[PDB]
Every structure is written in structure tokens, then in C-alpha cells.
Write a protein that binds this ligand. Structure first.
Ligand SMILES: *[C@@H]1O[C@H](CO)[C@@H](O)[C@H](O)[C@H]1NC(C)=O
Ligand SMILES: *[C@H]1O[C@H](CO)[C@@H](O)[C@H](O)[C@H]1NC(C)=O
Ligand SMILES: CN1C=CC=C/C1=C/NO
Length: 529
């Protein structure tokens, strides 16, 4: 049958799904590691152990233990991100979507999900790979990896909970794709890892990590960069936060040995219940458990790796959305709310700014205020709302990614840059938030093609237009077809394109203005004071 496949780990039998008018085959929930339950908790993952008999690949697997977002219960705008399958410490699986009939050796795309390192699932509807697979004849795989403390708790010296382990889960699935994707018709010479926010930062990170480089060809990064200030911590800090976790559960903090034995004793939900207390800062866009700069995963510091080409040289496509800040401010900042327009007082702006740049002293603080204030109208509520959206955007996504780009392209082998600024016509969040973080994904995964979710005509155009760009680049190293064109990004000129339902424009020097602020000036200033 098309649906029975022999793989180095065992025979797997999938299932066949409908898509638009045609069909496709789906393999759902293939395990690729020993379940990290028990007291494999926090440990590095181990390989699956071949099964006998025929693994059932026809339902979605579980989601990993994660914080579940209740802030707007019943609101789809927020629910669309929540685990939608049962949660379990047993959740290392992956999913494949293969064209019918099976290709022999075609392009592979591996999706890695975002979620701030504390959350996310392979199984959410917006990450359904059947449209992409179908429309572009590519093999589409989505992996899944451990989040929050289960995934990133890090007690350096120790082998019991070493750090970066979720990051290892990702690599382990990338191994299994490497070794078996050929039996599904995928060309392993030709995998593209691609992801959003934490997912983007992780792709970035496997460009850098030496044990990750050989496992893939090309990378696409959305709204995320391995150098984003919220994406890594020092080993000391990770140590500090793990022991802090131990405290709100009343563990013995005498050896590492005992901390871990303790944390391992606790039910998954009690770790989740207190995870947000270990933050060092009142802040937004910061997360508890996070890649740590351990020296084994990352041989050295991010910055100096970037500096001396110590990273995989291939070609990359990446980008930012127009309002990366809003979603964060809505959740975290005094003054913003889902149902009003959220005019912010000159009072609330100040505390907004404070929460966004939690490591700055106040001289640093003034420098920011100065930079983003309309001094001729320093009271307009709207201007403050927006100014704040740009601070959180720039400081957290746009400018660290621009820095990553500039260093990448000295030694890279081709670089393509987008600025997605389209607001979906049926977006269910309010207007003031604009083109929000995360909201290109549904265009990438091709949901505007499905009539009953209500998109414009042109939106569907934009979606396939994007999907092709993506699939072509994965297959080619170039988003463009042999004969108007998405230009390469160069250090000399720095062209990038708009992605949106009208005819594309090339521009230059994305937020260059403000990125020199965050990239050169502020850091020098905090270093002096
Ligand atoms: C097990 O296999 C059969 C069809 O092959 C079916 O009842 C069901 O979809 C599968 N159950 C799972 C994976 O839970
Ligand atoms: C990178 O790729 C090839 C193959 O090694 C080389 O000749 C090419 O011109 C390079 N291009 C860029 C975009 O740096
Ligand atoms: C969880 N989430 C909420 C808003 C926007 C993006 C997003 C990505 N999660 O992985």
C-alpha cells in the first residue's frame, strides 16, 4: 500500500487525508526517542529503540507538558495556540505529510514550532502541513520537543539535568529525518529547517551548534534569531533559576543531586504552576527556561561565533512582521486591553518602557524614551501606544535579527529578507495591534486556501505566493524561479521586500535608524555606566 513504510526503526503505517479536491498520505505521531518520563526527566533524550510489528501512524500524538493560556477563555485568537491534544511528559513524536502518489526523492521541510520556550505543539491546526505538502509537492515534517523546565532546566556541572535538552530533542528528530526520510520519498540532501519565534531562534541555534550543522541543508527563520535577548541565558543564571524553582517547591538545596531528585518527584503540573516565579525582573517578553550558553552545545559565546564565521554557511531566508510588539504588551503591560483602543498615558508609557528594557539603568531608560517619544505631542495616547509597540518589536525581534543578518552575510552563501505587513482581513484580535507576531504562519501553511475560513481572494493569492517562495527556496537556495525578483540581501545595499497583497516593493535598511540605537549605542552606554 502507499501507506505502509519501512524504516530503520520499524514498519510504520499511516493514513490517508483529504486536501482541497484531492488526497494525501499522513504519518502522525512517529516516536523518535525513548519517552523522557520517569527520571529521564530533564535528561538528554535517547534514540527510539526499534519496534516490532506495525506502528500506528494515524492519530496525532500528545502535546508536551506546558503552561496553558487562560487569559481569554473561549477567544479563538488566543486558543489557537493552546495544546489541543492531551498533555503528557511522553511526547517526543513527529509528523510527516507525503504527496500522493509518493515521490521518489523530493524536497523536505521540517517545521519547528515557536512558543517562547515554555509552550507549543506540533498538532495545532495552524501548523497542518497537508496544504503545503499538497500544493508544493514537498515532504513536510513537524517535530516536537520539550518545553519549560522539562526542556531547559539547567544545572550545569551535572549529568542529570545538563541544559539544552529540548534543543537536543530537536536534533534527535533531525537525525531521524536524515536517516529515514528517503523511505517516504524525501531527499535527505535537501532538508530545510524552518520556524517561528522560539522556533526561529532554534533554527538559528542549530546553524551555530557544531553537532547540528551536518543534519540539514538550508534554513528559514520567522520573527526569531538565536541572538534574541530572550532566547538564551548564562549557565550561572540558569543555575540560579533552577535553584529558585526548587525553593517554591521546598526542595532541599543541598546538592544538585537532591534538587533534581526532588524536582523529579513532583507532578508535572506543580513545576508549571510556579515556573513564572523564577524570573529575576519584572519584565515582558522574557521567559523562565531557555537555552543556556553551556559551552558544549554552543562552543562559545553567541556573539563571538557570529563574529568569526563559526557557523554553518548555507543560504537563509528570514523576516519580521510589522507589529511584533503588540501581543506582548496586551498580556503584560498596564494600559492595554483586548476590547479598547488602549491609549496609553505618559504615565503608563514610562512603566511600559521599564518592563521592556529590564536590564537598563535609568540613564539607559532616558535614552530610550528620548529615542521613541514624540516630543512635540509627548502626550498623545495613541502615539504612546504605538511607540511602545515599536520598542518591544525592535528591541526583541527586529533589531537582534538584523544584527544576526549582518554578521551572517559576511560569510553566508546567500540571504533573503522579508517584511510581512499584511493584516488578515478576518483577524479576530483588535485593530490597534496591527500585523501581529505569529500571524504570517497561517499564510505560510496555506489556510487562506480553505474557503470556509473566510479569506479574501487576494489573500489566497498572497498565501500561494508565499508558499511558493518558501518551497522554491527550500528546493533551490533561491525563492525565485528561473525567469519580478526577490533581490539578495547584501551588506553593501541591504535590500528586502514587502510581503503583502499588493505588488512587491524592494526597500532598503530595515529600521536602520533604531537598530543602530539598540545595536551599537545602548549597549555601549550600559557598558560605561
Ligand atoms: C490503530 O489502527 C487502526 C487502523 O489502522 C485504527 O482503529 C486507529 O486509527 C489506530 N489507533 C490509534 C493510532 O490510536
Ligand atoms: C555560494 O554558492 C556557490 C557554490 O559554492 C558559489 O559559487 C556562489 O557564487 C556563492 N554565492 C553567494 C550568494 O555567496
Ligand atoms: C503563542 N503565541 C501568541 C501570540 C503570537 C504568537 C505566538 C507563537 N506561539 O508559539
Amino acid at each position: 500500500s502507499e501507506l505502509l513504510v519501512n524504516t530503520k526503526s520499524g514498519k510504520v503505517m499511516g493514513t490517508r487525508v483529504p486536501v482541497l479536491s484531492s488526497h494525501i498520505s499522513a504519518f502522525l505521531g512517529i516516536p523518535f526517542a525513548e519517552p523522557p518520563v520517569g527520571n529521564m526527566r530533564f535528561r538528554r533524550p535517547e534514540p527510539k529503540k526499534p519496534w516490532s510489528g506495525v506502528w500506528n501512524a494515524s492519530t496525532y500524538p500528545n502535546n508536551c507538558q506546558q503552561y496553558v493560556d487562560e487569559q481569554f477563555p473561549g477567544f479563538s485568537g488566543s486558543e489557537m495556540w493552546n495544546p489541543n491534544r492531551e498533555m503528557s511528559e511522553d511526547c517526543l513524536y513527529l509528523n510527516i505529510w507525503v504527496p500522493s502518489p509518493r515521490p521518489k526523492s523530493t524536497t523536505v521541510m521540517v517545521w519547528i514550532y515557536g512558543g517562547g520556550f515554555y509552550s507549543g505543539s506540533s498538532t495545532l491546526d495552524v501548523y497542518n502541513g497537508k496544504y503545503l505538502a499538497y500544493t508544493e509537492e514537498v515532504v513536510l515534517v513537524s517535530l516536537s520537543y520539550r518545553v519549560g523546565a522539562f526542556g531547559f532546566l539547567a544545572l550545569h556541572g551535572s549529568q542529570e539535568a545538563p541544559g539544552n535538552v529540548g534543543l537536543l530533542d530537536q536534533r534527535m528528530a533531525l537525525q531521524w529525518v536524515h536517516d529515514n526520510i528517503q523511505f517516504f520519498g524525501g531527499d535527505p540532501k535537501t532538508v530545510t529547517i524552518f520556524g517561528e519565534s522560539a522556533g526561529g531562534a532554534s533554527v538559528g541555534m542549530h546553524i551555530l551548534s557544531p553537532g547540528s550543522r551536518d543534519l540539514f541543508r538550508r534554513a528559514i527563520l520567522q520573527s526569531g534569531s538565536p541572538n534574541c535577548p530572550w532566547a538564551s541565558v548564562s549557565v550561572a543564571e540558569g543555575r540560579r533559576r533552577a535553584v529558585e524553582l526548587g525553593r517554591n517547591l521546598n526542595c532541599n538545596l543541598n546538592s544538585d543531586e537532591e534538587l533534581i531528585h526532588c524536582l523529579r518527584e513532583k507532578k508535572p503540573q506543580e513545576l508549571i504552576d510556579v515556573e513564572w516565579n523564577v524570573l529575576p525582573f519584572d519584565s515582558i517578553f522574557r521567559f523562565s527556561f531557555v537555552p543556556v550558553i553551556d559551552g558544549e552545545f554552543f562552543p562559545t559565546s553567541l556573539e563571538s561565533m557570529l563574529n568569526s564565521g563559526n557557523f554553518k554557511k548555507t543560504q537563509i531566508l528570514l523576516g519580521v512582521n510589522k507589529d511584533e510588539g503588540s501581543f506582548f504588551l496586551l498580556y503584560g503591560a498596564p494600559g492595554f486591553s483586548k476590547d479598547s483602543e488602549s491609549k496609553i498615558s505618559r504615565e503608563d508609557f514610562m512603566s511600559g518602557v521599564k518592563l521592556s528594557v529590564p536590564h537598563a539603568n535609568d540613564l539607559g531608560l532616558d535614552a530610550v524614551t528620548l529615542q521613541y517619544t514624540d516630543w512635540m505631542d509627548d502626550n498623545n495616547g495613541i502615539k504612546n501606544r504605538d511607540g511602545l509597540d515599536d520598542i518591544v518589536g525592535d528591541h526583541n525581534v527586529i533589531c537582534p535579527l538584523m544584527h544576526f543578518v549582518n554578521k551572517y552575510t559576511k560569510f553566508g552563501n546567500g540571504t533573503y529578507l522579508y517584511f510581512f505587513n499584511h493584516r488578515a482581513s478576518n483577524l479576530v484580535w483588535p485593530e490597534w495591534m496591527g500585523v501581529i507576531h505569529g500571524y504570517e504562519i497561517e499564510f505560510v501553511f496555506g489556510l487562506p486556501l480553505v474557503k470556509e475560513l473566510n479569506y479574501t481572494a487576494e489573500e489566497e493569492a498572497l498565501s500561494r505566493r508565499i508558499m511558493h517562495y518558501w518551497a522554491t527556496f527550500a528546493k533551490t537556495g533561491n525563492p525565485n524561479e528561473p525567469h519580478s525578483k526577490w533581490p539578495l540581501f547584501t551588506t553593501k545595499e541591504q535590500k528586502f521586500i514587502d510581503l503583502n497583497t499588493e505588488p512587491m516593493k524592494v526597500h532598503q535598511r530595515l529600521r536602520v535608524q533604531m537598530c543602530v540605537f539598540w545595536n551599537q549605542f545602548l549597549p555601549k552606554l550600559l557598558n560605561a555606566t
